[PDB]
Amino acid sequence: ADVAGTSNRDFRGREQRLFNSEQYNYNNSLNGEVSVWVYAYYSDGSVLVINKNSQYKVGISETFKALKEYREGQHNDSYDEYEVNQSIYYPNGGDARKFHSNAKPRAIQIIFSPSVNVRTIKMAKGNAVSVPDEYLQRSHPWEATGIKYRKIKRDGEIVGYSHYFELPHEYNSISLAVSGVHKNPSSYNVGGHNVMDVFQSCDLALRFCNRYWAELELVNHYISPNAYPYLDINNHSYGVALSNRQ
Amino acid sequence: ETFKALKEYREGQHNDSYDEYEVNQSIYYPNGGDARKFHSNAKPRAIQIIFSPSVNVRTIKM
Amino acid sequence: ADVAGTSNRDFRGREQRLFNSEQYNYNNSLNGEVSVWVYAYYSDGSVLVINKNSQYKVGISETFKALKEYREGQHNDSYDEYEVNQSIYYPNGGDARKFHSNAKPRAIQIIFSPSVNVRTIKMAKGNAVSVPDEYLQRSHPWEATGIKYRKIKRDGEIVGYSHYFELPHEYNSISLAVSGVHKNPSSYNVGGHNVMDVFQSCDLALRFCNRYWAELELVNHYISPNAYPYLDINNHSYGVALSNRQ
Amino acid sequence: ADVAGTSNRDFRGREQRLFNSEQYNYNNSLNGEVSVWVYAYYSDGSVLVINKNSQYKVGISETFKALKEYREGQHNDSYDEYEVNQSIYYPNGGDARKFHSNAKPRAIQIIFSPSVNVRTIKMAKGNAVSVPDEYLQRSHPWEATGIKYRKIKRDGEIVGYSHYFELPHEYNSISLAVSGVHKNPSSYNVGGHNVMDVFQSCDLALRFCNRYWAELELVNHYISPNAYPYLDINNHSYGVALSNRQ
Ligand SMILES: Nc1ncnc2c1ncn2[C@@H]1O[C@H](COP(=O)(O)OP(=O)(O)OP(=O)(O)O)[C@@H](O)[C@H]1O
Ligand SMILES: Nc1ncnc2c1ncn2[C@@H]1O[C@H](COP(=O)(O)OP(=O)(O)OP(=O)(O)O)[C@@H](O)[C@H]1O
Ligand SMILES: Nc1ncnc2c1ncn2[C@@H]1O[C@H](COP(=O)(O)OP(=O)(O)OP(=O)(O)O)[C@@H](O)[C@H]1O
Ligand SMILES: Nc1ccn([C@@H]2O[C@H](COP(=O)(O)OP(=O)(O)OP(=O)(O)O)[C@@H](O)[C@H]2O)c(=O)n1
Ligand SMILES: Nc1ccn([C@@H]2O[C@H](COP(=O)(O)OP(=O)(O)OP(=O)(O)O)[C@@H](O)[C@H]2O)c(=O)n1
Ligand SMILES: Nc1ccn([C@@H]2O[C@H](COP(=O)(O)OP(=O)(O)OP(=O)(O)O)[C@@H](O)[C@H]2O)c(=O)n1
Ligand SMILES: Nc1ccn([C@@H]2O[C@H](COP(=O)(O)OP(=O)(O)OP(=O)(O)O)[C@@H](O)[C@H]2O)c(=O)n1
Ligand SMILES: [Cl-]
Ligand SMILES: [Cl-]
Ligand SMILES: [Cl-]
Ligand SMILES: [Mg+2]
Ligand SMILES: [Mg+2]
Ligand SMILES: [Mg+2]
Ligand SMILES: [Mg+2]
Ligand SMILES: [Mg+2]
Ligand SMILES: [Mg+2]
Ligand SMILES: [Mg+2]
Ligand SMILES: [Mg+2]
C-alpha cells in the first residue's frame, strides 16, 4: 500500500475527516439536535447547569426559586429561604435573618449549540414574580437577543454561541426562560406537514440538571467529556472543531 | 425524565440523599464522585413502557 | 562465584524455590492452617467476608439475620428490617414497608484453602429459621458438597477451592454453616492422642469479618495483600502458586 | 382397586403412616438433629427465642447482658442499661435511673427435641458475672437437671422436653448455658472413630434468635409452622405426634 500521510490514497485519513464532517453537518440537518444550556453561577463557586436537547426547537424555563442554589443532602436554610423569597417577591414581605441570600445566582450564561439559528433566539428575563417587563399588561413576552451572542470558536470554527450577563446588584432577582430554533435554511417548514413531529419533540426533549462545585469541575467533568461548547470566566473557549478536520 | 428523576425516592424515609448526590457525580463522569457504594439500589433495574390501545404504534418514538 | 542463572550453584535461586515450597507444604502439614471464607454479595455491590483460620478443622455458622448487609456508621432501616425478618420467618408475619430487602445476599461464595481435604467439606444451608431441610425431624444436619467445588488455579497449581451459588429468587432466604477438615493423609488421627489439642483449636481459631464496598476493593485490599485465593464474577482466579516455584 | 379405608391394600394410607414414622425415627437416629431452645420471657409480654440445631450434641450459652430484652430499631435506654448492668454485677456499682430493668427476663423455658437423651442434659445457671455457684473455686461447672424436665405430649407421644423456671425476684439475675446429647442407645461412641465429625458438628450447628411480641405470636408464627414442641403459660402442649400415625 501507499505510505501514510504522503498520497491521495490515505483512506484512513479521508475517512477520519469525513467522520468528523458528517457529525458537524448531521447536527445541522433537520434530523439533528439543537441544544441549550443555562448556567447559574453562585458565590460559593458552584454552578447549576440546566441543559435541554431536542429536535427542531428547544428551551428552558425556570422560576426565581428554581434557579436558587440547592445543595443536595446538605442544609439549605430552608425555612429562612422561604422568608427570603417572600421579601424578594414584595419588598419587606418576609422576615428573613439575612440581607442577601448566597443562593441567588451571581450571573447567568446561556449557551446554544452551533445548530441553532441565532436570529431565532428569544429570552424572557422576568422579575422575581415571573413578569417579563414590570406589569403583564405592557410586557412583550420575550426579547430577541441573538445580536448579543458571542461565537464560541475553536480552530476558527463556531462551536456554539454564548450570551452572558452578571447579576451583581441586590436588585438582580430574576426568573428566566430562553428558546431557540434549529437552523432551517430550506423552505420546508418543520411545523407544516411535520407539525405533529414537532409536537412529539416537545415530549422527546431530554433534560439534565446538576450542581457542580466549581467552574473547573464543570469544564473537566461536564463540558469536555461530552464535546460541549463553553466560555469560562477568563474568556477561554472550549469545544471541538469538526468540519473538514481530522 | 432525567436520570436523577427515575431514581427511587422513598417519600418520608431516608434516601442516603448526600451519598446519592455523590453517586450521580460518578454516574455522570467516571470517578467523578466520592460515594460510599459501588451500585445505587435507587437505579432502575428495568423499564416498561405501555401505551393505550388508542395509540398508533408506528408513531411511537423513544 | 558462579554467574546467576547459569549453574547448579545459584544458591540464592535454590533457597528462593525452597522457601516457597516450604510454605506450600507447611500449610499442608498437620501443623498448618486450614481456612474458610464465606462471601455474601449484596445488590449495592458490597461484599461481607467472614473468614476463620484454624488448625485441624475449621468452619463458619451464621444466622439469616447475621448475613444481611449492615453498614457500619450509616442508617440501615433498622426498624423496618426487624419487620422484614418477621415476614421472612413466616409469610405475612411482619409489617415492613418493602417487598425485597436489599440487605439480603444475592449470592454466596465459599472458599477453602488448598490445605482442606475436599471430601470432608460439609454445608448446612438452612432456611431462614435455621432448619436444614424443611422440618428438623427429616433433616440431615449437612450435605457433603465437595464434588461441587471448583479448583482455583494459578500457573497450574491448586491455590484454593470454590463453591458459588446465587440467591437470585425472592424465596432464596438462608441461614448457613460450612465446615472442612485439614488434609490428613496419615493414619495418625488428630482426634486421638491429640484430641485435647483439637479442643483447644476450637478456642484458638481466629475470625475476621468486614464489609468491603466492591469486588474490586475486596480483590485489591483483602484477597491480594494476604495471598488468599479467590474467583471473581468474570471467572478469573487469584492466588499465588508456590510449590517448586520461584 | 380396593375402596379407601376398608382393606390392607390402602397403600396411600400405609405410605402416609410410614412417612410420619420415618420422620420420627430418623430424628432419633445418629444421622438426625438434636435441638434446644431457650425462651426468655419479658414483662412487656415479648419473648426472646434462641434455638440451636445440630447433630450429636447441642447447646446455647449466653451472658446476663445478652439475655436482656433488646428491641431492634427502637430506643432501649442504652446508656441507663449500661449503668443497670454495673449495679447488677456488683451491688451499688452503677448510677442507673431505675430500680428494676424491665429488660431482665421474668422466666426461662428450656426445651429440647424428643431426640435428646434427658439423662445427658446439663445446665450452667450462673450469677450475673458468669460464675455457676458463688465463686469459681467451689463451682461445679453444671448441674444435671434432666429429672426436672417435663414431657411435652401430644396424642400420647413425647414431642419434646421442658424445664421452666421463673425469675420473679429482684435477685434473680442470671447467665445461662445449657447442653444435651442426642440419643445413642448403641455402643458406637460418636466421639470415637467419628470424633472429627463431632468437631465439624460444632461448626455446622445452625443458630436462630429473634424477639417475638407475645406468646400468641410465638405459638402461631414460630412453634407451629416449624412443628416444634412447646408448653404455654396455661400448661397447654403443642407439637405433632408422628410415630405410627397418619
Ligand atoms: N500560525 C498559523 N498560521 C496560519 N494559520 C494558522 C496558524 N495557527 C493556526 N492556524 C489556522 O488558522 C485558523 C484559525 O485557528 P485559531 O487557532 O486562530 O482559531 P481559534 O482556536 O478559534 O482562536 P484562538 O486560537 O485565537 O483562540 C485554523 O484554520 C487554524 O488551523
Ligand atoms: N506457552 C506455554 N507452554 C508450555 N507451558 C506453559 C506455557 N505458559 C505457561 N506454561 C506452564 O504451564 C503450566 C500451567 O500454567 P497456566 O498459566 O496455563 O495455568 P493457570 O494460570 O492455572 O491457568 P490459566 O493461565 O489458563 O488461567 C505451568 O507450569 C506454567 O508454567
Ligand atoms: N376417648 C378415647 N378413648 C381411648 N383412647 C383415646 C381417646 N381419645 C384419645 N385416645 C388415644 O389415647 C392416646 C392418648 O391421647 P391423648 O389425646 O389423651 O394424649 P395427649 O394429647 O398427649 O394428652 P391430653 O389430650 O390429655 O393433653 C392416643 O393413642 C389417642 O389416640
Ligand atoms: N427567618 C428564619 C429562619 C430560620 N428559622 C428557624 O430556625 C430553624 C432552622 O432554620 P432552617 O432555615 O430550616 O435551616 P436548617 O434547618 O439549618 O437547613 P434545612 O432546613 O435546609 O435542613 C427553623 O426550623 C426555624 O425554626 C426561623 O424562625 N426564621
Ligand atoms: N459520600 C457520602 C455519604 C454520606 N455522608 C455523610 O453522612 C450523613 C448522612 O448521609 P446522607 O447520605 O444524607 O443519608 P441520610 O441522612 O441517612 O438520608 P437522607 O439525607 O436521605 O434523610 C451526611 O450528612 C453526610 O455527612 C458523606 O459524607 N459522604
Ligand atoms: N415498618 C416500618 C419501618 C420504619 N418505621 C418508622 O420510621 C422510623 C425510621 O425507620 P428505621 O427503620 O429505624 O430507619 P432509620 O432510622 O432510617 O435507620 P437506622 O434506624 O438503621 O439508623 C422508625 O423509628 C419507625 O418509627 C416503621 O414504623 N415501620
Ligand atoms: N443513668 C442514666 C441514663 C441516661 N442518661 C442520659 O440520657 C440520654 C438518653 O438515655 P439513653 O439511656 O441513651 O436512652 P435512649 O437515648 O432513650 O435510648 P437508646 O440510647 O437505646 O436509643 C443519654 O444520652 C444520657 O445522656 C444518663 O445520664 N444516665
Ligand atoms: Cl435535513
Ligand atoms: Cl505433620
Ligand atoms: Cl444411626
Ligand atoms: Mg441526610
Ligand atoms: Mg430546617
Ligand atoms: Mg486556536
Ligand atoms: Mg496462567
Ligand atoms: Mg478417642
Ligand atoms: Mg431508626
Ligand atoms: Mg441514647
Ligand atoms: Mg390429646
Provide the residue ranges of all domains of chain C, joining segments of one domain with +: 1-246
Asked if residues D180 and D36 have their Cβ atoms less than 8 Å apart, the reply is yes
CB A130 within 8 A of CB A175: yes
DSSP tag of A119: G
User: Distance between CA atoms of C197 and C83, rounded to whole angstroms?
Assistant: 44
Amino acid, res. A157: E
Q: Give the cell for residue C237.
A: 482466579
First to last CA, chain C: 21
Amino acid code (one letter) for A107? A
Q: What is the DSSP string of A215-229?
A: HHHHIIIIITTTT--
C-alpha D86/C-alpha D132 separation (Å) is: 19
Q: Under DSSP, is residue C28 helix (H, G, I), strand (E, B) or coil?
A: helix
Tell me the backbone φ, ψ of residue D116, rounded to 5 degrees. -75, 155
Question: C-alpha grid cell for residue C126?
Answer: 438452612
DSSP letters spanning C94-151: ---S-SS-TTS-SEEEEEE-TTB-GGG-EEEEE-TTS-SSSSGGG--S-B--GGGPEE
Partner-chain contact C136 D33, CB within 8 Å: yes
Closest residue in chain B to residue C74, using alpha carbons only: B16
> Quick check: do C and A touch, 3+ CB pairs under 8 A?
no
Do residues C206 and C57 make contact, with C-beta atoms less than 8 angstroms apart?
Answer: no
The H or E element containing residue C22 is helix C11-28
- Residue C155 alpha carbon to ligand 14 centre in Å: 5
B21 contacts chain A (CB < 8 A): yes
Could you tell me if the CB of B14 is within 6 A of ligand 5? yes
Q: Which chain A residue lies closest to B31 (C-alpha atoms)?
A: A221
Whole-angstrom distance, CA of residue D162 vs CA of residue D124 = 16
Q: Is any Cβ of chain C less than 8 angstroms from the Cβ of D201? A: yes
Distance set, CA D7 to CA A176, D2, D13, D15, D16 (Å): 91, 7, 10, 14, 15
Contact criterion met (CB below 8 Å) for A38 and A60: yes
CA closest to C125 among chain D residues: D206
Residue A110 to residue A36: CA distance in whole angstroms: 7
A55, A33 contact by CB (below 8 A): yes
Header resolution in angstroms: 1.3
Chains touching B, CB cut-off 8 Å, 3+ pairs: A, C
Distances (CA, A) of A8 to A5, A14, A16, A246, C118: 9, 8, 14, 15, 67
Using the mean position of ligand 10's atoms as its centre, give its distance from the Cα of residue D29 in Å.
Answer: 4
Angle at D107 between CA D241 and CA D223, to 5 degrees: 30
Q: Is A235 in the pocket of ligand 1 (CB under 6 A)?
A: no
Q: What is the CA radius of gyration of chain A?
A: 21
Q: Looking at ligand 1, which atom is closest to the CA of residue A157?
A: 22
Ligand nearest to the CA of D79: 7
d(CA A197, CA B58): 12
Q: At what angle do helices C195-204 and D195-204 cross, to 10 degrees?
A: 10
Closest-CA distance, C65 to chain D, in angstroms, reads 9
Dmax (CA) of chain A? 80
| CA–CA distance, A69 with D122 (Å, rounded to integer) | 68
Pocket test for ligand 7, best of D72, D77, D99 (most atoms within 8 A of CB): D77
Residue located nearest, by CA, to atom 25 of ligand 6:
C79
Displacement of CA D191 from its chain's centroid (Å) = 23
Q: Which residues have a Cβ under 8 Å from the Cβ of C193 and sit 6 or more positions away? A: none
**N residues, chain A:** 246
Q: Which residues 22-61 in chain B show a CB within 8 A of chain C?
A: 36-41
Q: Which helix (H) or strand (E) holds C217?
A: helix C215-218
**Cβ-based burial of C155 (10 A; exposed 0-12, middle 13-18, buried ≥19):** exposed
Residue A140 C-alpha, separation from nearest chain B C-alpha, in angstroms:
31
- Look at residue D135 and give its three-state secondary structure: coil
Phi, psi (degrees; rounded to nearest 5) at C125: -100, 100
CA distance C85 to chain D (A): 9
Q: 3-class SS at D158?
A: strand
Q: Which ligand is nearest to the CA of D78?
A: 7
Mutate to test the pocket of ligand 2, among C155, C230, C243 (most ligand atoms within 8 A of CB): C155
D205 touches chain C (CB under 8 A): yes
Determine, for residues B37 and C45 on separate chains, whether the beta-carbon distance falls below 8 Å. Answer: yes
